């Protein structure tokens, strides 16, 4: 079984979100479970410089110009690079320049990634050819379309990490990307008058996966599918739609082992987490106080995440004795909003705007509650990290969050399954009730500790996940 993941990020080389963490870990898991997984990424500079044993495999002209295909290893997995510097040799984001605008040639940049992914099914590498091309999100969405145009020399799976990003390009571009003009159709890649790379993935793949069981269902609803629910419902009935929950990488997210933390700790020695708390309080500039719950946020700041509700509920949170530590980047309305909040309530709100990998560890390791109050959430790795760090997650019952967190309800406490806090509707009031709940639990320290241990007993394993994908790759044959 040979699989090629086609995608545009991979931790630790280049990461803008959860996709990178999946790509950084799933292939190794799959290899453990007896699938020969390789990864194909565009040669962005950070990726290129991480893969130091990369040799030339071949060299092609292409509708977007010349690529030289490289192959190397990284962390014991086979990595293919699309080396096309006129497209990819640009600093910073895969997706947009330094003043946050999509590169005007994105349509070529990502069509090519899709294209190379499909060429591998046909022998671009004379020595290795995948049986399944596994494509991730809109960036790799044309790969199944290129594969359909060639008569499907390999079976394809497209997995949606997030339905909200649709990869829309002007229809004329049908002219620049080398696909049959016939593919521009509602039964194909056309979507609301433009080209959709997402639609191309959803339509042309042999099978579609979402990154959690409940999100696989939610995307058959209009509330989450944004116009695609028609395709998704059909594809559901055909048995071509499923969810496979993400794992977490234990090499990099485990308090037992985590070298970025002031102090390491375990499910049985939670006393050792205290010190991470003091240090976080200091670093953020909060009153150093162990008698008080410290809530935390680590996320992209965009409407998806519900953070404006956190903002809205903060007075109520502070009024009960709580602290807030925030680390995140995006919506300047939110950035500014949160910065304002920290100014107004110094010593009880700390806020670092920006992206800092290592500091998210120091937060995960130090806080009592991580807040993930998403409007929608295909998986959400941060609450999985909070579970593992025994920092209890406070989430909205949607997507992966619904799949992975159990509320402190009396049944749940009694069955020994409660692992955090869940609220139901997208508004400050509904969130504030979960906040109150956490204040109540906090005043029953035994119970808090009991829930902490259950949180830290949940297991999110990539090798378990691999097995599900393996089953899929065999069903498609
Ligand atoms: N400001 C930040 N600094 C460091 N890491 C961040 C920041 N924002 C998000 N992350 C990380 O990115 C990942 C977020 O992935 P996830 O929870 O799946 O949501 P999404 O894929 O929608 O970003 C987590 O590993 C989280 O720690
Ligand atoms: O914003 S763009 O449409 O131009 C590009 C990407 O969708 C940015 N991402 C990568 C995938 N994401 C969701 C899963 O990690 C975060 C947004
Ligand atoms: O696929 C992993 C991550 O990627 C995309 C989603 O936005 C997020 O919920 C998920 O955790």
Curated annotation (Swiss-Prot):
Keyword set, alphabetical order: Glycogen biosynthesis, Glycosyltransferase, Transferase
Name of the gene: glgA
Function of the molecule: Synthesizes alpha-1,4-glucan chains using ADP-glucose.
Alphabetical GO biological process terms: DNA damage response; glycogen biosynthetic process
Top-rank taxon, per record: Bacteria
EC number per UniProt: 2.4.1.21
Taxonomy of the source species: Bacteria, Pseudomonadati, Pseudomonadota, Gammaproteobacteria, Enterobacterales
Residues annotated for ADP-alpha-D-glucose binding in this entry: 15
Classification via NCBIfam families: glgA, PRK00654.1-2
Pfam families in the record: Glyco_transf_5, Glycos_transf_1
Any one GO cellular component localisation term in the record: cytosol
Similarity field: Belongs to the glycosyltransferase 1 family. Bacterial/plant glycogen synthase subfamily.
The protein's annotated pathway: Glycan biosynthesis; glycogen biosynthesis
Catalysed conversion reaction: [(1->4)-alpha-D-glucosyl](n) + ADP-alpha-D-glucose = [(1->4)-alpha-D-glucosyl](n+1) + ADP + H(+)
The name this protein goes by in its record: Glycogen synthase
GO molecular-function term, one example from the UniProt record: alpha-1,4-glucan glucosyltransferase (UDP-glucose donor) activity
């Amino acid at each position: 079984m040979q699989v090629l993941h086609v995608c545009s990020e991979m931790f630790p080389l280049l990461k803008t979100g959860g996709l990178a963490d999946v790509i950084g870990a799933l292939p190794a898991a799959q290899i453990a479970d007896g699938v020969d997984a390789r990864v194909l990424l565009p040669a962005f500079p950070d990726i290129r410089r991480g893969v130091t044993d990369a040799q030339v495999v071949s060299r092609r002209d292409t509708f977007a110009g010349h690529i030289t295909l490289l192959f190397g290893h990284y962390n014991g997995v086979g990595i293919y690079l699309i080396d096309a510097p006129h497209l990819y040799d640009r600093p910073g984001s895969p997706y947009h320049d330094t003043n946050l605008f999509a590169y005007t040639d994105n349509v070529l940049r990502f069509a090519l990634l899709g294209w190379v992914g499909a060429e591998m099914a046909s022998g671009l590498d004379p020595f290795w050819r995948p049986d399944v091309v596994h494509a991730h999100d809109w960036h790799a969405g044309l790969a199944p379309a290129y594969l359909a145009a060639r008569g499907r020399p390999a079976k394809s799976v497209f997995t949606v990490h997030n339905l909200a990003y649709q990869g829309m390009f002007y229809a004329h571009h049908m002219n620049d990307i080398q696909l049959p003009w016939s593919f521009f159709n509602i039964h194909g890649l056309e979507f609301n008058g433009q080209i959709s790379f997402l639609k191309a993935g959803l339509y042309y793949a042999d099978h579609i996966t979402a990154v959690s069981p409940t999100y696989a269902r939610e995307i058959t609803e209009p509330q989450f599918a944004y116009g695609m629910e028609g395709l998704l419902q059909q594809r559901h009935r055909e048995g071509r739609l499923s969810g496979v929950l993400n794992g977490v990488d234990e090499k990099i997210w485990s308090p037992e082992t985590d070298l970025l933390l002031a102090s390491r700790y375990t499910r049985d020695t939670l006393e050792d987490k205290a010190e991470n708390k003091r240090q976080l309080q200091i670093a953020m500039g909060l009153k150093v106080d162990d008698k008080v719950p410290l809530f935390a946020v680590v996320s992209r700041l965009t409407s998806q995440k519900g953070l404006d509700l956190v903002l809205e509920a903060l007075p109520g949170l502070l009024e009960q004795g709580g602290q807030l530590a925030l680390l995140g980047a995006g919506d300047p309305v939110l950035q500014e909003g949160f910065l304002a909040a920290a100014a107004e309530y110094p010593g009880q709100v700390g806020v670092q705007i920006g992206y800092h990998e290592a500091f998210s560890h120091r937060i995960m390791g130090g806080a009592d509650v991580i807040l993930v109050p998403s409007r929608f959430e295909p998986c959400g790795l941060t609450q999985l990290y909070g579970l593992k760090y025994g920092t209890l997650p406070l989430v909205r019952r949607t997507g992966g969050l619904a799949d992975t967190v159990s509320d402190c309800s009396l049944e749940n406490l009694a069955d020994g399954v409660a692992s955090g806090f869940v609220f139901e509707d997208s508004n400050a009031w509904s969130l504030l009730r979960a906040i109150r709940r956490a204040f109540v639990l906090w005043s029953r320290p035994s119970l808090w500790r009991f829930v902490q241990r259950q949180a830290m007993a949940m297991d999110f394993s990539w090798q378990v996940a691999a097995k599900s994908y393996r089953e899929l790759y065999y069903r498609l044959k």
